[PDB]
Design a protein around this ligand. Structure first.
Ligand SMILES: Nc1ncnc2c1ncn2[C@@H]1O[C@H](COP(=O)(O)OP(=O)(O)NP(=O)(O)O)[C@@H](O)[C@H]1O
Ligand SMILES: [Mg+2]
Lengths: 239, 96
């Protein structure tokens, strides 16, 4: 196993810049990682307060007792016992996928491939973070490892759900990252506090055509619009 | 040492005593004092080790005693090494 740690180009991730400019690594080496995490300082004040209280509890030496209580409570295990347990799992078990797990994984592969295709069209360039058939095998290995914890001789639907969730939380999240006329049209034609049902906006804009969903993503990130009611109602919530 | 440590002004007398022939720059003298005494290095049950050393950057204009401060710290610290700019290679800094 290769566990690697790196900073982006420009050191801090530089969010408004393209990922293809922020990421040094070629798509060849990137594809060899089952999970790519892009880690960012969220700067959220509640989180920062929480981290500050935690880190103070580290430096004060409170954490020495806290970890021991957590271990004796059975909510945590030690370095030594975990080391032996990883060895035992690596020597006892090597699970297969059930047929149901196999189908869910296969359909998930075509789903994420479609997402990458449309994103490459929307950004009109090949993505730096890739999704390839090697990355299906990444989700397969993760599924098997998740079953390998409990020494289950087969992986099951639940393990595939967690494997898919982890891949979505890591490699997809790494991959995930004229309209100016249409947005001011929507601002003109939907005043504050009222709702346009989405499909009518789609018909009107088409009747003038993919600029619609870019406009909605921008206006939803801002306070001006709120996608109420299962996304059916475009609500001019803010300015 | 035990006697002078009792003085209410001892932190300030130490800080004033850092590089005494350099005028002003009490912030630099404070940063140098903090670095030269250092923090406490810590190790959380052996499972997580934490830096005790304090790293300091003197960023600024020419003719403002920065190099002289560093030469003083080379004079004063119990183990010290000094390496200017282009004179330091990657392996000459860490190991080779
Ligand atoms: N506050 C000061 N008190 C006394 N001498 C000073 C002071 N500021 C500068 N000098 C003198 O300025 C000269 C140059 O100091 P030096 O340490 O090389 O400055 P510097 O900050 O390193 N400038 P530079 O090397 O161009 O980045 C020395 O001979 C010092 O004595
Ligand atoms: Mg200098």
């Amino acid at each position: 196993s290769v566990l690697a740690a790196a900073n982006p180009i420009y050191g801090r991730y530089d969010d408004l810049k393209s990922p293809g400019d922020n990421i040094d690594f070629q798509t060849t080496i990137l594809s060899r990682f089952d999970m790519i995490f892009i880690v960012k300082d969220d700067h959220n004040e509640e989180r920062d307060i929480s981290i500050a209280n935690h880190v103070i509890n580290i430096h004060t030496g409170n954490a020495n007792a806290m970890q021991n209580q957590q271990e004796e409570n059975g909510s945590e295990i030690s370095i030594e016992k975990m080391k032996r347990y990883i060895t035992y799992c690596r020597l006892k078990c090597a699970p297969r996928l059930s047929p149901q797990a196999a189908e869910k994984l296969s359909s998930n592969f075509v789903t994420i491939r479609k997402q990458l295709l449309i994103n490459e069209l929307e950004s009109t360039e090949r993505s730096s973070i890739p999704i390839t058939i090697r990355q299906l095998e990444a989700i397969i290995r993760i599924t098997e490892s998740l079953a390998k914890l409990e020494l289950s001789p087969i992986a099951q639907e639940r393990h595939v759900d967690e494997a898919i969730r982890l891949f979505q939380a890591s490699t997809m999240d790494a991959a995930s990252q004229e309209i100016r006329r249409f947005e001011q049209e929507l601002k003109r034609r939907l005043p504050i506090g009222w709702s346009t049902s989405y499909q009518t906006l789609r018909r009107e804009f088409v009747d003038t055509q993919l600029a619609l969903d870019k406009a909605l993503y921008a206006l939803e990130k801002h306070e001006t619009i709120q996608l109420r009611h299962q996304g059916q109602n475009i609500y001019r919530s803010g300015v | 040492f035990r006697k002078i440590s009792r003085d209410r002004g001892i932190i300030d007398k130490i800080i004033s005593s850092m590089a005494p022939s350099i005028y002003g720059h009490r912030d630099i003298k404070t940063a140098v004092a903090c670095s030269l005494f250092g923090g406490v290095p810590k190790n959380v049950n052996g499972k997580h080790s934490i830096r005790g050393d304090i790293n300091v950057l003197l960023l600024g204009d020419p003719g403002t005693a920065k190099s002289q401060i560093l030469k003083y710290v080379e004079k004063t610290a119990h183990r010290a090494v000094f390496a200017t700019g282009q004179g330091a290679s990657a392996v000459g800094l860490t190991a080779s």
